[PDB]
Amino acid sequence: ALPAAPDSELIDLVTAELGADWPRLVAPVFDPKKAVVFDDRWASARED
Amino acid sequence: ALPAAPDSELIDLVTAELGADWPRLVAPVFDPKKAVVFDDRWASARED
Amino acid sequence: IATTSKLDEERLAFYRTLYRDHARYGAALWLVAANMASYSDVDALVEWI
Secondary structure: OHHHHHHHHHHHHHHHHHOOOHHHHHHOOHHHHHHHOOOHHHHHHHHO | OOOHHHHHHHHHHHHHHOOHHHHHHHHOOOOHOOOEOOOOOOHHHHOO | EEEEEEHHHHHHHHHHHHHHHHHHOOOOEEEEEEEOHHHHHHHHHHHHH
């Protein structure tokens, strides 16, 4: 209960000042391992 | 350490998205019992 | 009904002298310390007024 009090406080001021959906609406999703390249035109050209 | 971890991430994205001084710059100070009235003009008029 | 960042001795004296120097008719200077960068304080201020 000692750090849960200031943590709860921070939760309530981010709720009142910004909103209850701020963590979701702001959470990061970037990951460099999930990038995709699409530079295969020659095979597509042959299939076309 | 079970809620301190998500709370730590909360502090981290508050620092990254807003700043490390957001709780200070946003914290409330209003208290209805600390107001002051200054409507004593007659006594000031006599002293003047 | 004016607000200020903080209420201490110096601002108290300044505002007291301001009223006693400029007041007229039935003037009344309400005064409360509030944060203008906090929606909670804005809500409290409007519900107090």
